[PDB]
Amino acid sequence: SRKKMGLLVMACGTPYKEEDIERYYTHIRRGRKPEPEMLQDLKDRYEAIGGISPLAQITEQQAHNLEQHLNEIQDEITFKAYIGLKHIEPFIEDAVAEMHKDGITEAVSIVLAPHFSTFSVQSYNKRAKEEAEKLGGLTITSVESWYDEPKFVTYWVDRVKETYASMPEDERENAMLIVSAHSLPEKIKEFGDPYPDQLHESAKLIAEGAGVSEYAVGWQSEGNTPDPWLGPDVQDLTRDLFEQKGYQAFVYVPVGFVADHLEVLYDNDYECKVVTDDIGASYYRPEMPNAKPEFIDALATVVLKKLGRV
Ligand SMILES: *Cc1c(C)c(=O)n2c(=O)c(C)c(C)n12
Ligand SMILES: [Cl-]
Ligand SMILES: [Cl-]
Ligand SMILES: [Cl-]
Ligand SMILES: [Co+2]
Ligand SMILES: [Co+2]
Ligand SMILES: [Co+2]
Ligand SMILES: [Co+2]
Ligand SMILES: [Co+2]
Numbered sequence: 001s002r003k004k005m006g007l008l009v010m011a012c013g014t015p016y017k018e019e020d021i022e023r024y025y026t027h028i029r030r031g032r033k034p035e036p037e038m039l040q041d042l043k044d045r046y047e048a049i050g051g052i053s054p055l056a057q058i059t060e061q062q063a064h065n066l067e068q069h070l071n072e073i074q075d076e077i078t079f080k081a082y083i084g085l086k087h088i089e090p091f092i093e094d095a096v097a098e099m100h101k102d103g104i105t106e107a108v109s110i111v112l113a114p115h116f117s118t119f120s121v122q123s124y125n126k127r128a129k130e131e132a133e134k135l136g137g138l139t140i141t142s143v144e145s146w147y148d149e150p151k152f153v154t155y156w157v158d159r160v161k162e163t164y165a166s167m168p169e170d171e172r173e174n175a176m177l178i179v180s181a182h183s184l185p186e187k188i189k190e191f192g193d194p195y196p197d198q199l200h201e202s203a204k205l206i207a208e209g210a211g212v213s214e215y216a217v218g219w220q221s222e223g224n225t226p227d228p229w230l231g232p233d234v235q236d237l238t239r240d241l242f243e244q245k246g247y248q249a250f251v252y253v254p255v256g257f258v259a260d261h262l263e264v265l266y267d268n269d270y271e272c273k274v275v276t277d278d279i280g281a282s283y284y285r286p287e288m289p290n291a292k293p294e295f296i297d298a299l300a301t302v303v304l305k306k307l308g309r310v
């Protein structure tokens with residue numbers, strides 16, 4: 001008799017259509033509606049990267065493929081996936097309430113972001129556990145980080161190796177690897193937040209496995225509050241490294257992100273590409289994991305290790 005468990009898969013969320021941009025960004029901006037010029041700019045950015053609908057499908061495909069793969073690779077537990085999002089429905093609290101309604105009493109959760117931080121992961125896990133306590137009769141064990149799962153490191157190692165192998169010889173010998181995640185306010189350091197240290201370790205592990213001796217760590221997508229954010233930003237970092245040593249190719253691995261959305265398809269593939277085009281360097285950014293089987297198997301291993309079953 002297989003034990004039934006909920007599988008709570010958490011992520012940032014995306015709009016589902018253009019008419020959701022206003023409410024999604026209002027939520028991100030803590031209740032402040034974007035001005036009309038910003039709404040129009042955002043619509044244009046989503047159009048430029050191919051549209052909203054495909055981006056909105058990825059978390060669903062990740063959760064569905066993870067549920068089915070976990071149920072196939074072991075015989076003790078039957079998982080059912082529930083998606084809980086930060087900035088649009090279904091919200092984290094909606095997902096926990098659905099688990100409770102459906103008779104789930106025991107769940108494991110994972111955030112689709114590999115590094116722990118106090119701003120994101122800790123907040124998602126605390127929200128899920130508080131809703132479970134309010135409803136009663138349900139407990140959640142939560143994954144806190146997974147950047148160091150060997151199967152996840154290997155996903156990026158093999159993509160980097162392929163990109164370097166594809167380069168002309170002069171590029172391969174004069175290239176720079178930039179490994180990045182979403183910036184946060186520097187003030188997280190007051191709490192001892194390990195997020196920066198974990199990004200640096202991701203970068204070390206990926207460069208090491210791929211045999212890439214020249215690499216750098218940067219941040220992207222910072223906000224505009226007056227307090228300093230973690231830097232350097234990838235755009236400034238790229239230009240500075242070019243001025244120092246004249247690299248002919250830049251390879252971007254935004255390891256903090258696991259799915260296509262604006263902060264990769266725009267903040268790397270447009271904003272960093274503007275800089276590389278300006279300095280005459282080639283631009284490379286290997287594929288995001290999305291719902292590919294190699295990545296799903298890494299996530300399933302993370303979950304089963306957390307439960308002590310591997
Ligand atoms: C809020 C937001 C946007 C606009 C974006 O592109 N992304 C991501 O990639 C994440 C993880 C989050 C949150 N967002
Ligand atoms: Cl936590
Ligand atoms: Cl953990
Ligand atoms: Cl951790
Ligand atoms: Co247009
Ligand atoms: Co136009
Ligand atoms: Co199916
Ligand atoms: Co399937
Ligand atoms: Co550093």
Ligand SMILES: [Co+2]
Pocket residue numbers: 182221263
């Ligand atoms: Co952001």
Ligand SMILES: [Mg+2]
Pocket residue numbers: 018019
């Ligand atoms: Mg319409």
Ligand SMILES: [Mg+2]
Pocket residue numbers: 145146
């Ligand atoms: Mg750990």
Ligand SMILES: [Mg+2]
Pocket residue numbers: 221222267
């Ligand atoms: Mg920006």
